[PDB]
C-alpha cells in the first residue's frame, strides 16, 4: 500500500540513478585521463 | 499529503536522472567521436 510502491517507484529511480551516474564516471575516466 | 510528497520525491530523482542521463550522452559522445 502507498508508501511501498511509491517508494518502490523512487528507489527503482534510484537503481537508474546509480546505473547513469555509474555511468558518467566510467565515462569522466576517458574524458578524465 | 502522501503521493505529493513521495511523488515530489520519485520526479527530483528524476530530475537528476535526468542531469545524470544528459551528462552521460555528453560524455560518450566524446567516448564516441
Known sequence: ???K???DKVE?????NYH????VARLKKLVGE
Open 5 to 7: 510502491q511509491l517508494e
Open 12 to 16: 527503482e529511480l534510484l537503481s537508474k
Open 20 to 23: 547513469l551516474e555509474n555511468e
Open 1 to 3: 500500500g502507498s508508501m
